[PDB]
C-alpha cells in the first residue's frame, strides 16, 4: 500500500471534511508541520522536502495515465494539451491545431518537446479528489498542470507564476533552479511574468535535483526553470492556488461600496468641490506653491481614511465566498457520506423502481453533507444558498448554482451551516412551523447538500 493510497483510505474514515482537508495537507508536506509551514514559509520562502520515498505519490498520476487519456479521451492541443520547448534562449510553442493523438504527441516528445496537461483533474478522478480536498483548507481554488519532459531538454523558459506553487515529482529526475524575487515589485507578484533569458537572472536561492516523492514549494514571484539531464525524463504535477486572493483584491471590492455608502450617509462626502481647484490641481500644477493645493491633498487623505468606517467588510467576504463556491471543484464523498445521502438512496430500476418514497421526518437527524459545499449570501433583500455539488470538474463550465432560502428558514439554515458535523434533529430546527422544518430539510437533502444519521429507510 503506497502512502498516497494509505492516506486516502484514511481520509475515507475521517468524519469531517474540514479535518480531512487538514490531514491531506499534513500528508502533502510531511514531515514538516503545517503550522510551521504557514507561519514561516508560506508566501515567504522556497521550500524543498526530500521525501526519501520514491513511492510517496504512487497512484496520483503517471505517464501511462496520460497515454491512455490521449487514446481514450478527446484531448485537444491548446485547449487541453500544450507542447513547448526551450532552445537557444528561445521559447517555442509547437501546437498542431486539432486533437492530440498518441502519434502526434509522442512525435513531438521525441523531438524534444515537453507536454503539459492543463486540467488533469478533468481527466483523472484521483487528481480531482486531491485538489477537491486541498481546496477546502486553502480557502482558495486549487488547480494543477502536469508537465512531462523528455531527457536532455528544457520545455519552458525561466519565469515566475502568479500562484503559490507546490511541485510534486512523480517520475524521473529534474534539475530545478528557483530564484528569490528580483526586485521589490516582483515579490508576491500580481500577474504571471514574461519569459526571461538567463541574463535576466541572478543566482539561484535553491538548486537541486528533484526525485519522485519530493516536493518543492515557492511563492508567486519566485522565478524558476527546470531541465532534464542525460538519460531520464521527468513527470511532475504542479499544484497551484491563491490566484488574486490578496488584501488588495478585497479592497478593490470594498472601496466602491465604501465610498457610495459614505456619500449616502455623511454630508462631508456630498459637499461640492472647489469652483477653482482646476487652477491648482493637475499634472500641470504639481509644483505649484499654492497653499490651496496642500489643503486639497490633506482633505483627500482625511476623507479616504474615513472610508474605513463605511466599508461593508462582511458583504465582500460573502461575495468572495460565493465566487469561491462557483470556483470550486465538486465534492468527493466518502463511502459513508454517500450511503447517508440522497446519492446513496437504494432507489433504482430493479420493470419498476424499487425502494422509493423514503421521507424525512421531524425525528430524522441531519447535517450538511460536507463543510465547504455551501454558502449563504444576501443579495437585494433575498437570501440564496450557493453550493458546489453540481459544479463541473472543468473551471466555470457550469454557471453559479443556488437555491433561495426564505426568511422563515434563514435561522435554521445558518444553524446547519454553523454546527457541522453535529447532528441536528429536524424537529429542533429554529423555524416558525413544522412545515418549514420539514420543507427546508427535504429541499437541502434532495439537492444533495445534507445527510442523515441513519439512511432514510421509509
Amino acid at each position: 500500500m503506497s502512502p498516497l493510497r494509505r492516506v486516502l483510505a484514511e481520509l475515507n474514515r475521517i468524519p469531517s471534511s474540514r479535518r480531512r482537508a487538514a490531514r491531506l495537507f499534513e500528508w502533502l508536506i510531511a514531515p514538516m508541520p503545517p503550522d510551521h509551514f504557514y507561519r514561516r514559509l508560506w508566501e515567504r520562502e522556497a521550500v524543498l522536502v526530500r521525501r526519501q520515498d520514491h513511492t510517496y505519490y504512487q497512484g496520483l498520476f503517471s505517464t501511462a495515465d496520460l497515454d491512455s487519456m490521449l487514446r481514450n479521451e478527446e484531448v485537444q492541443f491548446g485547449q487541453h494539451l500544450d507542447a513547448a520547448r526551450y532552445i537557444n534562449g528561445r521559447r517555442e510553442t509547437l501546437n498542431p491545431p486539432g486533437r492530440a493523438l498518441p502519434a502526434a504527441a509522442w512525435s513531438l516528445y521525441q523531438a524534444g518537446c515537453s507536454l503539459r496537461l492543463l486540467c488533469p483533474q478533468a481527466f483523472s478522478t484521483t487528481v480531482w479528489q486531491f485538489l477537491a480536498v486541498l481546496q477546502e483548507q486553502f480557502g482558495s481554488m486549487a488547480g494543477s498542470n502536469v508537465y512531462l519532459t523528455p531527457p536532455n531538454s528544457q520545455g519552458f523558459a525561466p519565469h515566475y507564476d502568479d500562484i503559490e506553487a507546490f511541485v510534486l515529482q512523480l517520475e524521473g529526475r529534474k534539475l530545478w533552479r528557483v530564484y528569490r524575487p528580483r526586485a521589490p515589485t516582483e515579490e508576491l507578484a500580481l500577474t504571471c511574468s514574461p519569459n526571461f533569458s538567463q541574463d535576466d537572472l541572478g543566482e539561484p536561492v535553491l538548486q537541486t535535483v528533484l526525485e519522485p516523492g519530493d516536493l518543492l514549494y515557492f511563492p508567486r514571484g519566485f522565478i524558476h526553470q527546470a531541465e532534464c539531464q542525460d538519460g531520464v525524463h521527468s513527470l511532475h504535477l504542479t499544484l497551484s492556488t491563491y490566484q488574486r486572493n490578496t488584501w488588495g483584491d478585497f479592497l478593490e471590492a470594498i472601496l466602491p461600496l465604501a465610498v457610495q455608502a459614505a456619500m449616502e450617509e455623511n454630508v462631508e462626502f456630498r459637499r461640492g468641490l472647489p469652483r477653482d481647484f482646476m487652477d491648482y490641481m493637475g499634472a500641470q500644477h504639481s509644483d505649484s506653491k499654492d497653499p490651496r493645493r496642500t489643503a486639497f491633498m490633506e482633505k483627500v487623505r482625511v476623507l479616504v481614511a474615513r472610508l474605513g468606517h463605511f466599508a461593508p467588510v462582511d458583504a465582500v467576504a460573502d461575495q468572495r465566498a460565493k465566487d469561491f463556491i462557483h470556483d470550486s471543484l465538486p465534492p468527493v464523498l466518502t463511502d459513508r457520506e454517500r450511503a447517508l445521502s440522497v446519492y446513496g438512496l437504494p432507489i433504482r430500476w430493479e420493470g419498476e423502481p424499487v425502494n422509493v418514497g423514503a421521507q424525512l421526518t421531524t425525528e430524522t437527524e441531519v447535517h450538511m453533507l460536507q463543510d465547504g459545499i455551501a454558502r449563504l449570501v444576501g443579495e437585494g433583500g433575498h437570501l440564496f444558498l450557493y453550493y458546489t455539488v453540481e459544479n463541473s470538474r472543468v473551471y466555470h463550465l457550469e454557471e453559479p448554482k443556488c437555491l433561495e432560502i426564505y426568511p422563515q428558514q434563514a435561522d435554521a439554515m445558518e444553524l446547519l451551516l454553523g454546527s457541522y458535523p453535529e447532528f441536528v434533529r429536524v424537529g429542533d430546527l429554529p423555524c416558525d412551523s413544522v412545515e418549514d422544518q420539514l420543507s427546508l430539510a427535504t429541499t437541502l437533502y434532495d439537492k444533495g447538500l445534507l445527510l442523515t444519521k441513519m439512511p432514510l429507510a421509509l
Binding site: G78, Q79, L118, C119, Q121, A122, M141, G143, S144, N145, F156, H159, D161, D162, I163, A165, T191, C192, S193, P194, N195, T238, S240, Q243, V394, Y395, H396
Partner: peptide, 12 residues
C-alpha cells in the same frame, strides 16, 4: 507574459 502555468485549467 501570459500564464505560463494555467492555474484555472483552460487557456485564455
Amino acid at each position: 507574459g501570459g500564464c505560463n502555468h494555467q492555474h484555472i485549467g483552460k487557456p485564455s
